Design a protein around this ligand. Structure first.
Ligand SMILES: *[C@@H]1O[C@H](CO)[C@@H](O[C@@H]2O[C@H](CO)[C@@H](O)[C@H](O)[C@H]2NC(C)=O)[C@H](O)[C@H]1NC(C)=O
Ligand SMILES: *[C@@H]1O[C@H](CO)[C@@H](O[C@@H]2O[C@H](CO)[C@@H](O)[C@H](O)[C@H]2NC(C)=O)[C@H](O)[C@H]1NC(C)=O
Ligand SMILES: CC(=O)N[C@@H]1[C@@H](O)[C@H](O)[C@@H](CO)O[C@H]1O
Ligand SMILES: CC(=O)N[C@@H]1[C@@H](O)[C@H](O)[C@@H](CO)O[C@H]1O
Ligand SMILES: *[C@@H]1O[C@H](CO)[C@@H](O)[C@H](O)[C@H]1NC(C)=O
Ligand SMILES: *[C@@H]1O[C@H](CO)[C@@H](O)[C@H](O)[C@H]1NC(C)=O
Ligand SMILES: *[C@@H]1O[C@H](CO)[C@@H](O)[C@H](O)[C@H]1NC(C)=O
Lengths: 220, 655, 213
């Protein structure tokens, strides 16, 4: 709906080798209270170190990054600004064995749902050395049947392109003690938030409230 | 590389400290990547030769900066000018180890110049913080005419106008003056009693003498001065309890030198990795050029910070001010100064003993010594303020009422009793009615004494700008409050935005609107007979009033207003008679005034009802300390039912 | 008295061609019929050069700059817009000989104006090597008497601030020949203008309309 007034889009060489001065000049010349950046982990570290050098990491500005950055999710490094926001999918805290169990559950449910129509698990075709096979309708039917699946609240519906559609994403952010924490859920196209305001930090870590802001009370 | 910097001092002893500092800073980085030297000169009694000597110092090396300090000479103003102007030709950055004049911050006149100590102008921030702490709102500012005083006043006014509060009174005396009792006399006759001083030492002493002669240095007063006014002969005789403030460790002249060399080294290290190695000017003759990277060097030097300075963390303002130097609060405890608290320019932390005030009391003084004799101004309005002549015995004739109690009356002076032709005459009269009774109750409720009088023109009061001028002064009663004629307004004064800009009201005590009176097709303001001019119906109002503004505040009604500009009355019930004499077709005015007379006399009717609603309220000068209590009395009156009993008495006894 | 409804104010940072990107974006997104700019002569060559790239020099727009720029009135440079309005004090066409004549005339007029008072012809200070002149003697009249003195019907009232007050000044602009021309004087505070309608010489704006009673 809203206009989404865009300010400036910049592409800078943030690789291992390059001229740091040019990117320093480019980053030092900007003014916008929200930043959205798309880089890789090493590039993210380089970019954030340079930004911290050129005064863009204090309590004034805000950063947003896709899940391609952020690395491990269990070892946030230095120069990462507090308040970095990302959106990870459901099961960003489960165990490896639990995820393997979920995978075996999906496979078993797909096979079982196939049986309720025809009644047999298709035979394998693993001639790696022989490499045969034109289009095969049997495995095609099995795969077509394998797309959709649900499991006690968690629905894993795969798109034609092999990425699932309609998941329950969760927003995460870096708490004031360098530890990832959930902020807002997302289920069926409606967003939620832990806070009614964006808590905003500082260098000494005492949180501040904007001067042009206030809280109004009323009732019915 | 061989990087060279310079300096100018006057000690011949602290120059050894300068070379020690530059060598010790070279110990921080000495891999020959850059290498540091040091040169110096001394001051001289003559200025032209001083400039020529700085010229030859500059040619001596490929200098990158200049450091200048204050000699044992007593002429602290012009001492750093001959070095600043000359080098200013070539944009060679310079630093000031110790200088406080506020002319060196004008970056359009000294092109390249920095500082490591805040100027005398920055004290206004400390004064503003102290005012915010102790809650003194009515302030008096006494300043001089030299540029420093104007700069300090401008900064303080910038802060106060940023909070939109303004100053009670600003008054200045030209420098080098004596026997100036007139200005202190002019400042003595106001309610605000806190006065803020900034002048030279001799002028401070003269002001102290005059004020001590005028009794204005005793109890009930608090005045805080800067730092230039408690030194030398001025400190000799002064009233006890004068607040002041001193620098953190200024006038050391050797603490700032380490910070200067450190920041210079930190800047030159960052500069030398740039593509444009112009290399500083070499030669004081023939070279009618500038340094190709002087502005860039100044810019990088400005935005280069320091880690651990002897005088604290060092940053620079937009012009090179010291940027968060410390400050020490002072006092006068029986002829001996003392430290009372430390303020870092952002907040004040009292970390010492208790502070005594001039009167010897221990409780905090408050400003605005509240007067008890108040003037009052009002206008002749029939339902509210009746004016009558008095008898020969000296009292207007008594008038009892059906209730069994008499009508209150007071004595109101001021007019000529004949507006059109009167050479000069003021007469005493009697006033009574609604607003007079309200004033009686208010005065008896809050312990004060009143001396009522009437306006000098007869109009309510409306802002206007006369020709051949750019300033607009209020006319009539509304003007009388602003210029200082009156102190309060007990009259049917409506509350509009323009009035609220410069005065401040209490809570409303009577609501109303605007309406039309007609002698028994006429209707509200929508008919083409009204929107367009025609001789069948003629409308008018009272000139220089609120309705005039309301009809000049609308572009889409221009023609109608123009109609009103043709002819209107500067009048009173006289307009009601002009309607009565069939001269005027209809009248448009406040609700209560019309509704009283319509049901009161005869044969007149009010057309429809109100369209634009507004209230009545008392008028008081900006941020006066009486408004809160007046409003609390008005609301109490509304809750009691007294305005109810009062209302029937004067308006419901009709029809 | 007029409403004077203003659109925006912008502070640029334009110099050598290293930092010349942010000003481009700031200049890109501002639109108005009239511009009032403040820069030096060594910077108009950057401002107008960047303005000609973002469509701001066409006949739709018009510019006004004070006399600080255009320092070399004799030979105006390239890349300047055709028809920008500035104001210059009187005697912008005078010759150097005329200027020194005017200076010696004003000085001698003040001197002889005191001479008519038959007081003196005060001598200057001694030299530079003594640092003399501690206070202001009765010589202070001379400087004062050097203010009001007029010459050849030209008011030369000098303010206490060291600049002349209420002179006559003219308006100049750049025609389609790149040489300045007079437009209108300001004698006694009434504007004269040579053109009843601005010429707008040479996408676009500023379209003309017609109507009748
Ligand atoms: C480094 O500084 C020293 C002194 O600060 C310079 O030596 C001075 O040179 C001038 C030349 O006019 C002489 O008048 C002084 O007497 C010298 N002073 C001393 C203490 O030797 C030296 O020239 C500077 N380095 C360079 C490369 O110029
Ligand atoms: C020009 O201005 C001066 C004031 O600066 C006028 O007044 C002269 O002021 C000095 C003060 O030292 C007196 O002693 C003179 O007597 C004043 N006038 C004269 C000439 O006697 C001066 O009159 C002004 N001249 C004009 C053109 O009106
Ligand atoms: C109470 C406090 O710490 N404030 C200041 C401090 O900022 C400053 O550094 C010091 C002198 O350097 O004087 C004190
Ligand atoms: C002299 C004076 O004004 N002081 C008043 C006094 O008269 C008044 O009676 C009292 C309240 O009763 O408040 C106080
Ligand atoms: C989708 O889900 C339905 C519901 O169980 C199932 O019958 C079907 O086999 C699944 N796959 C396709 C391709 O419809
Ligand atoms: C100057 O500062 C130094 C360092 O803090 C201090 O030791 C000295 O007492 C101060 N005063 C003088 C006159 O040196
Ligand atoms: C206002 O009223 C309070 C009590 O209601 C009183 O204590 C105070 O002195 C009054 N202030 C003034 C300025 O009259």
């Amino acid at each position: 709906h809203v206009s989404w007034r865009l300010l400036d889009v910049v592409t800078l060489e943030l690789g291992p080798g390059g001229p740091r001065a040019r990117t320093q000049r480019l980053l030092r010349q900007l003014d916008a209270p929200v930043f959205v950046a798309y880089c890789s982990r090493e590039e993210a570290e380089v970019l954030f170190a340079e930004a911290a050098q050129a005064g863009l990491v204090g309590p004034g500005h805000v950063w947003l990054v896709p899940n391609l950055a952020l690395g491990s999710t269990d070892a946030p490094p230095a120069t990462f600004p507090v308040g970095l926001i990302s959106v990870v999918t459901e099961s960003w805290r489960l165990s490896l064995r639990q995820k393997v169990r979920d995978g075996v559950a999906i496979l078993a449910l797909g096979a079982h749902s196939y049986w309720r129509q025809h009644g047999t698990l298709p035979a394998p075709a693993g001639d790696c050395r022989v490499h045969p096979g034109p289009v095969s309708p049997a495995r095609e039917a099995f795969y077509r049947h394998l797309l959709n699946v649900t499991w006690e609240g968690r629905d894993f519906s795969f798109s034609p392109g092999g990425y699932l559609v309609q998941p329950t994403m969760v927003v995460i952010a870096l708490n004031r003690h360098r530890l990832w924490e959930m902020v807002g859920r997302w289920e069926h196209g409606v967003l939620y938030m832990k806070y009614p305001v964006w808590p905003r930090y500082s260098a000494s870590l005492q949180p501040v409230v904007d001067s042009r802001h206030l809280t109004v009370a009323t009732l019915e | 590389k061989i990087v060279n910097i310079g300096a100018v001092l006057s000690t011949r002893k602290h120059e050894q400290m300068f070379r020690e500092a530059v060598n010790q800073a070279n110990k921080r980085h000495g891999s020959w990547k850059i290498q540091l030297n040091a040169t110096s000169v001394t001051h001289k009694p003559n200025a032209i030769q001083m400039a020529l000597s700085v010229c030859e110092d500059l040619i001596s090396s490929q200098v990158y900066a200049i450091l200048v300090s204050h000699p044992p000479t007593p002429n602290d103003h012009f001492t750093p000018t001959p070095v600043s102007y000359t080098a200013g030709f070539y944009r060679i950055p310079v630093l000031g180890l110790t200088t406080r004049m506020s002319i060196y911050s004008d970056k359009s006149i000294h092109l390249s110049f920095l500082r490591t100590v805040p100027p005398y102008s920055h004290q206004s921030s400390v004064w503003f913080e102290m005012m915010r702490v102790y809650s003194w709102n009515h302030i008096i500012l006494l300043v001089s005419d030299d540029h420093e005083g104007r700069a300090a006043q401008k900064r303080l006014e910038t802060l106060l106008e940023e909070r939109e509060s303004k100053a009670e009174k600003v008054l200045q005396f030209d420098p080098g003056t004596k026997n100036v009792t007139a200005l202190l006399m002019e400042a003595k006759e106001l309610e605000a009693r806190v006065i803020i001083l900034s002048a030279s030492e001799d002028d401070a002493a003269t002001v102290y003498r005059a004020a001590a002669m005028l009794n204005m240095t005793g109890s009930g007063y608090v005045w805080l001065v800067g730092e230039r006014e408690i030194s030398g002969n001025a400190l000799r005789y002064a009233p006890d309890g004068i607040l002041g403030l001193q620098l953190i460790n200024g006038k050391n002249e050797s603490a700032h030198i380490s910070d200067a060399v450190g920041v210079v080294a930190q800047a030159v290290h960052e500069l030398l990795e740039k593509e444009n190695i112009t290399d500083p000017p070499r030669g004081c003759v023939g070279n009618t050029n500038i340094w190709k990277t002087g502005p860039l060097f100044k810019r990088v030097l400005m935005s280069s910070k320091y880690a651990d300075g002897v005088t604290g963390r060092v940053e620079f303002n937009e012009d090179g001010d010291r940027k968060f130097a410390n400050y020490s609060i002072m006092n006068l405890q029986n002829r001996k100064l003392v430290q009372v608290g430390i303020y870092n320019g952002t907040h004040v932390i009292p970390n010492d003993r208790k502070i005594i005030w001039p009167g010897g009391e221990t409780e905090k003084p408050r400003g605005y010594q509240m007067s008890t004799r108040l003037k009052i101004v009002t206008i002749h309005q029939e339902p509210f303020v009746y004016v009558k002549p008095t008898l020969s015995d000296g009292t207007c004739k008594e008038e009892f009422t059906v209730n069994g109690d008499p009508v209150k009356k007071v004595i109101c002076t001021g007019p000529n009793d004949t507006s059109p032709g009167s050479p000069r005459h003021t007469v005493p009269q009697c006033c009574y009615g609604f607003c007079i009774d309200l004033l009686i109750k208010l005065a008896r409720t809050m312990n004060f004494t009143y001396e009522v009088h009437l306006v000098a023109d007869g109009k309510f009061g409306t802002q206007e700008r006369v020709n051949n001028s750019n300033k607009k002064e209020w006319n009539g009663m509304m003007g009388e409050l602003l210029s200082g004629q009156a102190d309060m307004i007990v009259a049917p004064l409506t509350i509009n935005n323009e009035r609220a800009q410069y005065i401040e009201f209490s809570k409303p005590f009577k609501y109303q609107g605007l309406t039309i009176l007609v002698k028994k097709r006429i209707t509200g303001i929508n008919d083409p007979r009204l929107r367009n001019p025609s001789d069948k119906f003629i409308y008018a109002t009272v000139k220089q009033s609120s309705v005039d503004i309301y009809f000049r505040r609308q572009v889409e009604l221009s023609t109608m207003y123009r109609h009103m500009e043709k002819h209107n009355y500067e009048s009173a019930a006289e307009a009601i008679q002009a309607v009565r004499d069939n001269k005027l077709h209809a009248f448009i005015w406040d609700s209560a005034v019309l509704e009283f007379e319509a049901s009161q006399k005869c044969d007149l009717v009010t057309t429809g009802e109100l369209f634009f609603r507004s209230g009545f309220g008392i008028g008081m000068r900006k941020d006066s300390p009486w408004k809160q209590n007046v409003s609390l009395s008005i609301l109490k009156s509304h809750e009691n039912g007294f305005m109810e009993d009062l209302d029937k008495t004067w308006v419901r006894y009709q029809e």
